């Protein structure tokens, strides 16, 4: 009962020059800012009617992350980060039932650095519209976790595949799902 | 296929029995390793590895940078917790329970918080052995799901019932099958 | 209106 943890998990990454600032509540994203749009984005739209958080402060708080980043890169005699491969897995929002809206879940977990490529394939063909994802959700052992969502009407006719690619994955990792599940 | 360098700071406030005992914890990580940190109970920075020593020293030298890191547990943790309890600490979403065959499967989905109990009853009496779980499973949308499977001989007349105990609901949920 | 979530201010390293 009520023993909780809130985390401010941010990060900067050279040479990709990308970074993220996000809060974690017992493992769920409360919100995050995109260095890209300079807009804070709550995980559950609603939360934004209960709390406020100006984006800059994060961006601001990131600049220092780069500065410090560099400073540490040198101090470390330019040693590079050791890549760790993702461990993909396919999920379904709920148990699938024909003609009943549902949602495929691509679960990218236990990896690093925070850089990946995910691609949804409905019968070889990739899906580009309607999909969605999470930022880089922080893990306890300090690796990364990510989620990719593709809502859909369950059927036997078509099948799906999640294609994750990582700098620790020799060949693109490929996961399958077909109206069925273990 | 070019090297990458990673700064991973982590400010993690730890609450226990609400706000009665908080614990700040500033933690830095060059690439995936902890270098320098700050425990709110150690009252001052400490390097876990070499790469952080300098960092540990310089911060411990500046009064501000310490008068702050200490003031964390009150002006940051107690603060935020006060702002998000309303919608997180108290968040509660009821489980959607379904039972279908294979081996009997009881599926609990879309619930929150993750605390949960799933029990099987065979003709009115809980079966304590022969169950395979899947453990809690986050979905990244603020709702967990888990499946519990019971291995049995579905004989006629028999009635199986999945019982799901969850803070979201006042009296346990149960769905019977057959 | 609306309570604001404070963020721990990042400090510069040596």
């Amino acid at each position, epitope marked *: 009962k009520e023993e909780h943890v809130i985390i401010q998990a941010e990060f900067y990454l050279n040479p990709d020059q990308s970074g993220e600032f996000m809060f974690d509540f017992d493992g769920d994203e409360i919100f995050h800012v995109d260095m890209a749009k300079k807009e804070t984005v709550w995980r559950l739209e609603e939360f934004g009617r209960f709390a406020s958080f100006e984006a800059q402060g994060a961006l601001a708080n990131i600049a220092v992350d780069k500065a410090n980043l560099e400073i540490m890169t040198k101090r470390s005699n330019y040693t590079p980060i050791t890549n760790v491969p993702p461990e993909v897995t396919v999920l379904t929002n709920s148990p699938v039932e024909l003609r009943e809206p549902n949602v495929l879940i691509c679960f990218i977990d236990k990896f690093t650095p925070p850089v990946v490529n995910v691609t949804w394939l409905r019968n070889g063909k990739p899906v580009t519209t309607g999909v969605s994802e999470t930022v880089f959700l922080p893990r306890e052992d300090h690796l990364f976790r990510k989620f990719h969502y593709l809502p859909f009407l369950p059927s036997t006719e078509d099948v799906y595949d999640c294609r994750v690619e990582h700098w620790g994955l020799d060949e693109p990792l490929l996961k399958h799902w077909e109206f069925d599940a273990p | 296929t070019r090297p990458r360098f990673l700064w991973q700071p982590k400010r993690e406030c730890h609450f226990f029995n609400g706000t009665e005992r908080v614990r700040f914890l500033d933690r830095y990580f060059y690439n995936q390793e902890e270098s320098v940190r700050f425990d709110s109970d150690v009252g001052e920075f400490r390097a876990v590895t070499e790469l952080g020593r300098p960092d540990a020293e310089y911060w411990n030298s500046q009064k501000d940078i310490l008068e702050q890191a200490r003031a964390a547990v009150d*002006t940051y943790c*107690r603060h*935020n917790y006060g702002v998000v309890e309303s919608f997180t600490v108290q968040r509660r979403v009821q489980p959607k329970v379904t039972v279908y065959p294979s081996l009997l499967v009881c599926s609990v989905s879309g619930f929150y918080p993750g605390s949960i109990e799933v029990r099987w009853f065979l003709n009115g009496q809980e079966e304590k052995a022969g169950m395979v779980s899947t453990g809690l499973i986050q979905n990244g949308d603020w709702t967990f799901q888990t499946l519990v499977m019971l291995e049995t001989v579905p004989r006629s007349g028999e009635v199986y019932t999945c019982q799901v105990e969850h803070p979201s609901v006042t009296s346990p949920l149960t769905v019977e099958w057959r | *209106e609306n309570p604001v979530v404070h963020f*721990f*201010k990042n400090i510069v390293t040596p």
Partner: T-cell receptor
Amino acid sequence: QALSIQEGENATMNCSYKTSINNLQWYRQNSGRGLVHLILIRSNEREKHSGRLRVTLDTSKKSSSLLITASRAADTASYFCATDTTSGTYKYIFGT
Amino acid sequence: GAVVSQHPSWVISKSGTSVKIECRSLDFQATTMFWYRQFPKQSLMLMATSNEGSKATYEQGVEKDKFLINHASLTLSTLTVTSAHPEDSSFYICSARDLTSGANNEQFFGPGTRLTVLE
């Protein structure tokens, strides 16, 4: 009822506040003033430098107190403190 | 750093006009600022909070109507009193949280402005 000193006496200004504090700011004053940014006392106690100055925060009774180990002509004024309420916005509301 | 500039320090507008004060910033970015209206003794009073990031603005206590705040810079703000009266004559000081303070809310008040709205 006066700060008798051109050198020494004790400033005894009890500044209070309503909402639970996070940060405590000290601003004593002249007329048409910008400030007096003395020092900041955040939830804790004892931080007061530069002599006539003495910051004593006591959450228990919701009140501070600035004491001056050495009055002067410049240190006579109109003084008050401002505070930011916790788990609120960043707004600061002075006291008295 | 820190510095503040309320353009019209001493401004005179007939009892019935529009006097506009411009709380600006130095070399820091101010996502949010505040307007305090003080008089002879009463402790500096908070009139409203103004913050870019479209979020409107939050007038305090009850003072509600006129006196319109237009924060757009994240540098500047602007307080245009509407109409006018010889009761609105008081001191007008403004602060501006340093967008990067984060916790330890760091604000910096401006010099001030005495609006002389004579009848």
